[PDB]
UniProtKB/Swiss-Prot annotation, chain A:
The modification Phosphoserine is found at S19, S31, S51. The lineage of its organism: Eukaryota, Metazoa, Chordata, Craniata, Vertebrata. It comes from Homo sapiens. Homodimer. Heterodimer of an alpha (TPM1, TPM3 or TPM4) and a beta (TPM2) chain. Interacts with HRG (via the HRR domain); the interaction contributes to the antiangiogenic properties of the histidine/proline-rich region (HRR) of HRG. Interacts (via N-terminus) with LMOD2 (via N-terminus) and TMOD1 (via N-terminus). It is linked to Cardiomyopathy, familial hypertrophic, 3: A hereditary heart disorder characterized by ventricular hypertrophy, which is usually asymmetric and often involves the interventricular septum. The symptoms include dyspnea, syncope, collapse, palpitations, and chest pain. They can be readily provoked by exercise. The disorder has inter- and intrafamilial variability ranging from benign to malignant forms with high risk of cardiac failure and sudden cardiac death. Cardiomyopathy, dilated, 1Y: A disorder characterized by ventricular dilation and impaired systolic function, resulting in congestive heart failure and arrhythmia. Patients are at risk of premature death. It is found in: Cytoplasm, Cytoskeleton. Detected in primary breast cancer tissues but undetectable in normal breast tissues in Sudanese patients. Isoform 1 is expressed in adult and fetal skeletal muscle and cardiac tissues, with higher expression levels in the cardiac tissues. Isoform 10 is expressed in adult and fetal cardiac tissues, but not in skeletal muscle. The molecule is in a coiled coil structure that is formed by 2 polypeptide chains. The sequence exhibits a prominent seven-residues periodicity. This is Tropomyosin alpha-1 chain. Belongs to the tropomyosin family. Changing E25G: In CMH3; no change in homodimerization; decreased in hom odimer thermal stability; decreased in actin binding; increased calcium-dependent regulation of myosin binding to actin filaments; dominant effect in the homodimer.
Length: 55, 55
């Protein structure tokens, strides 16, 4: 019973931690994509601002 | 006197036979206890090996 309880507890922990990791990675990739959108939007707005900045 | 000693030897035979057959019954119940012990032993040794392997 000692070993069985120990391993079942640690298996519970394994399932929950891998659950954490999956959506952590997912939201990380989503934040990366949104950051790429901010990047391209920044480049475009700076281009517009510099072209308008001539006069 | 011959009849007296005849009867006394007879009653002594009776007592000895009582003791001997009771001892026989006891040894038979003991050897049965021992085989039951041994089969419980094999079962518990097997569950011991199972518990140890799984642990």
């Amino acid at each position: 019973e000692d070993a069985d309880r120990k391993y079942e507890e640690v298996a519970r922990k394994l399932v929950i931690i891998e659950s954490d990791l999956e959506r952590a990675e997912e939201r990380a990739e989503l934040s990366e994509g949104k950051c790429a959108e901010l990047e391209e939007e920044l480049k475009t707005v700076t281009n517009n601002l510099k072209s308008l900045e001539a006069q | 006197r011959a009849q007296e000693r005849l009867a006394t030897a007879l009653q002594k035979l009776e007592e000895a036979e009582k003791a001997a057959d009771e001892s026989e019954r006891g040894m038979k119940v003991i050897e049965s206890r021992a085989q039951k012990d041994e089969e419980k032993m094999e079962i518990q040794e097997i569950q011991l090996k199972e518990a140890k392997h799984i642990a």
